[PDB]
Amino acid sequence: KMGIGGLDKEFSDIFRRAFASRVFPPEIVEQMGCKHVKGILLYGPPGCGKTLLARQIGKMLNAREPKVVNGPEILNKYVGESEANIRKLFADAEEEQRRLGANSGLHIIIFDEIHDTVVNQLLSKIDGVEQLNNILVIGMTNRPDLIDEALLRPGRLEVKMEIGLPDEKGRLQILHIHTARMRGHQLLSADVDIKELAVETKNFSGAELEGLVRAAQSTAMNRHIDFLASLENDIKPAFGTNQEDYASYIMNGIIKWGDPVTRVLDDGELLVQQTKNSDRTPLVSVLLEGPPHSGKTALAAKIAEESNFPFIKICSPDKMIGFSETAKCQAMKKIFDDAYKSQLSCVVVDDIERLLDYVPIGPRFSNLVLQALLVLLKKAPPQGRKLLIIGTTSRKDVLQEMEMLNAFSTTIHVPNIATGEQLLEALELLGNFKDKERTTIAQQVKGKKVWIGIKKLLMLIEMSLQMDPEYRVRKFLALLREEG
Amino acid sequence: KMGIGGLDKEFSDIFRRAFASRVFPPEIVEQMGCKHVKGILLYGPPGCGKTLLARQIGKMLNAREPKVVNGPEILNKYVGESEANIRKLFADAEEEQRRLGANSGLHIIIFDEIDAICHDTVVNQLLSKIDGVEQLNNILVIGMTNRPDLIDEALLRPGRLEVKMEIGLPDEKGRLQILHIHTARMRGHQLLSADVDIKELAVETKNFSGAELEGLVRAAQSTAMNRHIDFLASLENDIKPAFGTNQEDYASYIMNGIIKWGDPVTRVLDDGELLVQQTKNSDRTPLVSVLLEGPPHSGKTALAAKIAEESNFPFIKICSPDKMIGFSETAKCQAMKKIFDDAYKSQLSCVVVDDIERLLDYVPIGPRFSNLVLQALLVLLKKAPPQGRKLLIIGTTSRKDVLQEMEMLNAFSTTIHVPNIATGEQLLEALELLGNFKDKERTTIAQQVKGKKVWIGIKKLLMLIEMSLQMDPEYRVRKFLALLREEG
Ligand SMILES: Nc1ncnc2c1ncn2[C@@H]1O[C@H](COP(=O)(O)OP(=O)(O)OP(=O)(O)O)[C@@H](O)[C@H]1O
Ligand SMILES: Nc1ncnc2c1ncn2[C@@H]1O[C@H](COP(=O)(O)OP(=O)(O)OP(=O)(O)O)[C@@H](O)[C@H]1O
Ligand SMILES: Nc1ncnc2c1ncn2[C@@H]1O[C@H](COP(=O)(O)OP(=O)(O)OP(=O)(O)O)[C@@H](O)[C@H]1O
Numbered sequence: 001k002m003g004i005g006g007l008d009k010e011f012s013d014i015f016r017r018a019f020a021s022r023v024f025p026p027e028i029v030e031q032m033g034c035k036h037v038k039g040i041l042l043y044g045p046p047g048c049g050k051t052l053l054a055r056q057i058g059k060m061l062n063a064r065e066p067k068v069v070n071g072p073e074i075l076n077k078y079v080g081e082s083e084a085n086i087r088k089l090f091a092d093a094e095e096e097q098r099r100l101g102a103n104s105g106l107h108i109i110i111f112d113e114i115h116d117t118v119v120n121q122l123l124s125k126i127d128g129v130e131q132l133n134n135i136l137v138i139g140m141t142n143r144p145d146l147i148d149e150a151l152l153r154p155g156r157l158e159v160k161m162e163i164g165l166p167d168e169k170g171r172l173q174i175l176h177i178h179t180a181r182m183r184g185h186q187l188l189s190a191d192v193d194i195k196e197l198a199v200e201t202k203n204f205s206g207a208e209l210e211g212l213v214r215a216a217q218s219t220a221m222n223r224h225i226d227f228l229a230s231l232e233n234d235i236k237p238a239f240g241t242n243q244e245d246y247a248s249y250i251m252n253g254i255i256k257w258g259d260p261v262t263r264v265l266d267d268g269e270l271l272v273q274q275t276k277n278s279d280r281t282p283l284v285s286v287l288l289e290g291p292p293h294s295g296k297t298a299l300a301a302k303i304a305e306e307s308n309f310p311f312i313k314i315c316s317p318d319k320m321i322g323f324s325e326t327a328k329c330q331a332m333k334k335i336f337d338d339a340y341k342s343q344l345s346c347v348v349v350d351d352i353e354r355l356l357d358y359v360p361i362g363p364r365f366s367n368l369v370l371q372a373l374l375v376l377l378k379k380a381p382p383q384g385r386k387l388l389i390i391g392t393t394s395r396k397d398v399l400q401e402m403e404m405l406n407a408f409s410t411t412i413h414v415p416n417i418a419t420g421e422q423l424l425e426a427l428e429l430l431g432n433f434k435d436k437e438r439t440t441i442a443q444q445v446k447g448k449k450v451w452i453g454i455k456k457l458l459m460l461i462e463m464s465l466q467m468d469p470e471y472r473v474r475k476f477l478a479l480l481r482e483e484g
Numbered sequence: 485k486m487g488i489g490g491l492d493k494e495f496s497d498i499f500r501r502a503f504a505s506r507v508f509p510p511e512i513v514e515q516m517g518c519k520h521v522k523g524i525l526l527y528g529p530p531g532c533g534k535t536l537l538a539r540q541i542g543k544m545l546n547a548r549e550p551k552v553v554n555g556p557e558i559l560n561k562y563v564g565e566s567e568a569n570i571r572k573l574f575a576d577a578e579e580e581q582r583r584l585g586a587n588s589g590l591h592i593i594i595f596d597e598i599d600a601i602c603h604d605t606v607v608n609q610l611l612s613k614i615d616g617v618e619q620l621n622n623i624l625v626i627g628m629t630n631r632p633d634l635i636d637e638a639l640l641r642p643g644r645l646e647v648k649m650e651i652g653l654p655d656e657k658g659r660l661q662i663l664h665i666h667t668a669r670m671r672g673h674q675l676l677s678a679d680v681d682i683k684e685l686a687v688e689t690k691n692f693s694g695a696e697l698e699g700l701v702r703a704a705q706s707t708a709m710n711r712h713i714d715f716l717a718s719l720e721n722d723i724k725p726a727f728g729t730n731q732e733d734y735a736s737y738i739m740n741g742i743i744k745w746g747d748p749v750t751r752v753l754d755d756g757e758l759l760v761q762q763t764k765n766s767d768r769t770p771l772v773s774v775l776l777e778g779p780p781h782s783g784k785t786a787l788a789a790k791i792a793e794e795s796n797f798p799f800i801k802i803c804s805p806d807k808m809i810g811f812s813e814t815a816k817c818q819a820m821k822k823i824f825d826d827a828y829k830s831q832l833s834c835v836v837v838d839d840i841e842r843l844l845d846y847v848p849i850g851p852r853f854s855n856l857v858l859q860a861l862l863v864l865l866k867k868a869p870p871q872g873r874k875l876l877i878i879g880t881t882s883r884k885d886v887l888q889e890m891e892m893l894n895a896f897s898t899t900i901h902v903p904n905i906a907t908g909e910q911l912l913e914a915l916e917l918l919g920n921f922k923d924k925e926r927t928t929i930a931q932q933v934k935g936k937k938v939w940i941g942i943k944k945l946l947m948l949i950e951m952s953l954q955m956d957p958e959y960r961v962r963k964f965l966a967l968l969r970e971e972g
């Protein structure tokens with residue numbers, strides 16, 4: 001019953017279905033009158049440690065098959081030849097079967113990361129023309145869709161198993177085996193707690209866990225010449241579902257220069273709570289319109305932080321620079337798929353107008369990306385999962401023409417400072433100019449109208465700070481004069 | 485007379501053309517003075533268990549053929565070889581026959597995955613032996629190929645493979661035959677499941693291939709094995725397919741269901757059902773087209789889907805934007821084409837196109853749309869299924885105007901409007917059916933809305949309800965009202 005962390009119910013059923021029908025001795029099979037299943041295939045997100053499962057299963061099924069491994073290329077060596085080889089590893093099994101056929105020989109052959117002749121070659125050998133039973137094959141692949149349809153049908157590959165990311169209880173199981181092994185030997189860390197580690201991590205693949213423990217071991221080794229596990233949590237992943245990177249996007253934090261910002265956050269909070277509640281629709285779409293510049297992206301990022309979903313991934317142009325419309329679309333699809341994988345998914349789209357490549361002249365924009373996006377907002381996550389979409393548009397007006405705007409469920413304005421009060425409020429929270437300086441600025445704005453973002457303001461501020469301590473204030477007022 | 489589930493009449497024809505000529509003894513052939521046909525080819529959709537049929541024919545035609553099996557690859561070995569090997573395999577039966585030609589030896593060679601077989605010269609080589617200048621009669625070849633089109637024309641042609649067999653998905657009676665044999669074998673031994681009925685399983689399944697059908701049964705004994713350490717079969721029905729047809733799925737598309745908030749929705753559903761009946765009964769016209777036009781958030785896709793459960797057709801599939809992202813006009817065309825082909829393959833079926841305006845790639849500015857997909861759509865829309873075949877197609881749109889200017893609208897036989905709620909009380913009715921709010925607040929809303937005018941789509945409305953819930957109990961309704969007014 002060891003060792004494989006998590007995957008016990010699914011594993012149990014799959015195990016039963018392939019193995020139990022074979023196992024009952026011996027009249028039972030005739031009574032069943034069912035040909036033994038030919039193969040079981042598992043398709044999983046990358047990094048799920050499918051392979052460990054396969055080695056264990058192969059070992060478990062027979063005293064000795066004894067295991068056969070197939071290189072991914074399979075058909076490597078062009079001249080005749082290789083294709084024949086793909087026929088050949090099977091050939092040994094078929095030969096054994098003709099020689100002893102009836103009972104009781106089982107051969108296991110496995111192809112990792114599974115065109116022309118080889119397709120047909122495998123299909124013919126696995127099923128038909130005559131017999132070919134008494135052997136089983138398991139295929140491990142990152143994506144189901146890539147693979148050919150014909151293999152899939154019940155028969156040659158009747159059962160297809162999808163391996164989910166570990167359950168928290170399951171996550172606790174993967175960590176639990178390694179930890180238990182550490183437990184059995186005297187050395188252990190008292191501070192570290194299994195329940196605590198489990199509660200802390202939702203997203204991680206098995207691998208991720210073994211990786212974390214291993215890193216903790218390295219850290220421990222290092223100390224001799226929470227604890228190490230806590231330090232590993234602090235660094236080691238690189239999870240790809242962790243979103244440590246997202247926090248960095250905002251260089252200057254969020255400044256409460258005024259009430260509207262707070263309103264944006266309680267609103268963001270409401271959106272998060274709603275998506276958390278889970279009735280009806282699990283998908284919500286938001287686009288927030290603000291004057292060019294300010295923390296459009298920053299606000300979105302803070303909302304994402306607030307949400308605390310297991311999976312947060314930010315789709316932005318910068319990652320995608322120079323890509324063909326098709327390449328960008330592929331990347332986007334990839335990220336959304338990854339988001340589908342998590343039970344809870346949070347996604348943000350960065351400068352949506354930029355993605356489309358809208359150009360005011362023309363107007364020319366890349367249609368393929370827009371349609372893909374519209375389908376995606378329209379698209380609904382597979383059951384049991386809730387997805388959060390955040391979109392930031394510099395200007396809505398383009399979008400209203402687009403009809404993009406209709407698709408989005410809710411829209412939040414994020415206006416630039418329009419009053420002297422909010423202005424000084426910003427200078428104060430930012431704490432840049434002196435009390436005297438700020439008093440002067442106030443005496444030069446209070447009662448007057450303004451129209452400037454926060455980031456743009458930050459810029460003007462540093463630009464004014466460069467000038468001598470006697471020219472800073474005047475310079476500032478000289479800048480605010482141009483940015484009206 | 486065993487064993488092959490379904491495929492009996494066709495089986496009789498396949499049997500009859502090759503076997504009848506050869507079997508009659510012996511003057512009959514000379515009186516006919518007709519040369520025996522060389523080979524039979526059957527081409528089928530995947531999973532029809534064609535291979536089982538081949539095995540049966542191989543067992544059945546001769547006491548010993550002796551059966552010959554050909555690897556798909558055929559052409560393996562660069563060094564000599566493949567051409568030579570192919571000729572060698574062809575040659576032996578012929579040599580036996582030349583040695584004894586007259587009577588009484590017939591030789592059967594079986595071919596699997598012909599498309600791989602038929603590259604360059606090696607394909608040419610096969611052709612020569614069958615159509616060979618001297619004799620070569622009394623040799624029988626059967627080829628199983630998933631796709632007919634790929635194979636060279638000369639093989640299809642009378643002579644080497646005069647007869648071409650097309651194998652249809654199992655008939656319900658036939659489906660009953662495939663299930664019936666395994667079940668019967670189970671019947672013969674004492675163990676059986678009393679609850680399970682063959683007719684019931686058959687009525688439940690229309691679409692499935694015979695191999696797949698065996699597979700559910702395979703699932704079922706296994707479930708029984710689990711049990712020892714309807715019934716199990718019912719569970720298998722729940723998770724055996726993987727049908728590749730219908731895939732129940734609709735609940736996933738129809739997430740919240742179809743409540744009866746209004747008079748119009750019922751009329752529309754009924755209309756759809758009447759049209760379904762009409763499809764089922766009209767012989768003059770093979771193809772039926774319908775289009776649903778509504779303001780955005782109407783629920784048009786869900787309604788179309790609802791109609792699809794209602795038809796109860798053997799094969800139901802939905803053509804979706806969601807499925808296709810990032811493709812190029814030609815890729816969209818291929819996918820659409822294949823799906824519609826799949827519909828032709830079934831005897832009668834309903835195919836639903838969802839968000840057509842989106843499907844085209846259309847955007848309001850320009851306007852910009854991708855032409856190739858659209859043309860594909862129109863030709864497909866005009867088009868008539870192979871005779872004796874009926875297809876039901878549903879189109880979902882909100883941009884009717886654009887379609888009308890386009891001339892898209894004209895192709896459709898009929899259009900049914902699917903209007904957003906216009907009376908506030910009707911909207912209230914939707915609320916009690918959904919049953920979300922408590923009695924008093926609903927009364928307050930009723931006081932607020934009665935007598936006033938509204939334009940709310942149903943999905944959009946539910947979303948508004950969800951938005952309303954999030955606020956505190958004494959902050960739920962006012963929030964809702966504010967959303968409605970803002971939406972105004
Ligand atoms: N839940 C788990 N059960 C078993 N092994 C796991 C699990 N999570 C991670 N692993 C690790 O993963 C390995 C086997 O699965 P693996 O992650 O290799 O699948 P994979 O998709 O091939 O991985 P990768 O894509 O990172 O190469 C084992 O060595 C084990 O350390
Ligand atoms: N009150 C605040 N609101 C928003 N951002 C703030 C605030 N205080 C400091 N910042 C910092 O300002 C940055 C905002 O940049 P952002 O691009 O989001 O603004 P923008 O006007 O949308 O610019 P762009 O037009 O390039 O999108 C963030 O990195 C954030 O950390
Ligand atoms: N209607 C049916 N009649 C006979 N056999 C069936 C039927 N449905 C399923 N089968 C099973 O399927 C097998 C024959 O169909 P098979 O899957 O070989 O056709 P195929 O399309 O050539 O398969 P593939 O293309 O996947 O290799 C038999 O072993 C039989 O048990």
Ligand SMILES: Nc1ncnc2c1ncn2[C@@H]1O[C@H](COP(=O)(O)OP(=O)(O)OP(=O)(O)O)[C@@H](O)[C@H]1O
Nearest residue numbers: 738739740741742743749780781782783784785786
């Ligand atoms: N009478 C009705 N007609 C349609 N949908 C209804 C009805 N009553 C309740 N609903 C619910 O509303 C939802 C409508 O979903 P659907 O995706 O069809 O909307 P839609 O027209 O596609 O919206 P959009 O076209 O803007 O994406 C379904 O979950 C359905 O259960």
